[PDB]
Design a protein around this ligand. Structure first.
Ligand SMILES: COc1c(Cc2cccc3ccccc23)cc(=O)n2c1SC[C@H]2C(=O)O
Ligand code: NA
Ligand code: NA
Lengths: 236, 227
């Protein structure tokens, strides 16, 4: 990813070091009065909110490279009581105090813009998932999630397009699709195998009817085309 | 709003005039090759989409002052096949070609931060709505929309928090009609003498708690008025 590498260089040039995190660590947390800008270079994370009673809500998933800001760039205060939890075995991130960020993102036009456009991608991402859920309900959500997986992590094999993720759980798939109970997920996963869309072999998921995912996640597919055309084009 | 008045003045300093639009007009549309930055100064709009069978989906509401960008700031290409439709009687907006926004933001850091922060408000807004829907379904969504109306247009009175929005625009915003009428039946919101009054703000806060937190974090002075 060209413009991701250009942003890495900018940060290192200015004395910002990568940091390594392991699974289950919080890169930033909902109880901290200091807010940060996170340049997630490598790894997979999820945004969570933890209620008083202890229930954990999974709000959004990110893979490197991406930018996540826990505070507003102007006020430096929280945008919401959120944690950024590492769910891959390792992740690499640059961690910048918000105040320190402004002293930098100014002197440069191009790098301001890279972060700007990432927020734009994210705004449109949530709108597309909402549109698909409004039309096709939970099937839309799950199809969109599998579509994402296929575009980002798919490899061509004779058994179909193999999702090359190792730790992927039926539960983590539901949370990533906004469905919190394994009953709904297994029901819909059942139909998908039953309609020959997905198959499970060798601990991995293989997609065999990619057109079907596109049919039920059409606005997320649109989003992929418009925001990630290079990727999208691999399988279109 | 100060950051926004200062942004209006920056646009006029660089010679951008306001345009006026009337209800049902599109400020931008999904078929235009040119993408734009809209500085919505006054009025109420909605973001719409069309599915491949002709059905219109309402995705998002915006009120002035706010910034809506139909194209990515770097590539200048569509962020999605969206239209921006006016739902108040009139709206006032500044309409800027996307490439020209880079130039303007590149030369003033104050106004770059102001636009950047409107994207941050959108992102956190959608996350809060999702959280509330995840917990209370469509009741959470509906309570949250009424809560935001209350905080934005509400005025304390002896009959409760009056919503100072004409009943016209109040109508422009199936299982929904049932939820709304149950809130009316339970006197959360009440018709009296040709206006509507929120009489149970605590109920709205209870079922849209994450959007209530969003307003507190995003607009603390407005939140504070009614709390
Ligand atoms: C599949 O649903 C979503 C929506 C869309 C969405 C659906 C329903 C109600 C919503 C209300 C407000 C905003 C989005 C909604 C977005 C999203 O980020 N995630 C999910 S699941 C987790 C997260 C993500 O995709 O990473
Ligand atoms: Na924090
Ligand atoms: Na357009």
């Amino acid at each position: 990813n060209a413009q991701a590498e250009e942003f890495k260089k900018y940060l290192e040039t200015n004395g910002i070091k990568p940091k390594q995190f392991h699974k289950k660590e919080l890169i930033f947390n909902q109880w901290d009065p200091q807010e940060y800008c996170i340049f997630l270079y490598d790894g997979i994370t999820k945004l969570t909110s933890i209620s008083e009673n202890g229930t954990i809500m999974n709000l959004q998933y990110y893979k490197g490279a991406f930018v996540i800001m826990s505070g507003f760039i102007d006020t430096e205060t929280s945008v919401g009581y959120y944690n950024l939890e590492v769910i891959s075995e390792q992740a690499t991130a640059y961690v910048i105090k918000i105040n320190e960020l402004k002293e930098l993102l100014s002197k440069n036009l191009t790098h301001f813009f890279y972060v700007f456009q990432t927020l734009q991608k994210q705004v449109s991402y949530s709108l597309a998932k909402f549109n698909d859920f409004s039309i096709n309900g939970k099937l839309g959500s799950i199809c969109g999630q599998l579509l994402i997986l296929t575009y980002v992590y798919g490899k061509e094999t004779p058994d179909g397009i193999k999702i090359t993720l190792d730790n992927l759980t039926m539960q983590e798939l539901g949370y990533s699709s906004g469905i919190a109970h394994s009953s709904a997920v297994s029901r819909i996963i059942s139909k998908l195998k039953q309609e020959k869309v997905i198959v499970y072999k060798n601990s991995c998921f293989y997609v065999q009817n990619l057109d079907y995912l596109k049919r039920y996640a059409p606005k997320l597919d649109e989003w992929f085309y418009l925001a990630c055309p290079a990727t999208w084009g691999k399988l279109n």
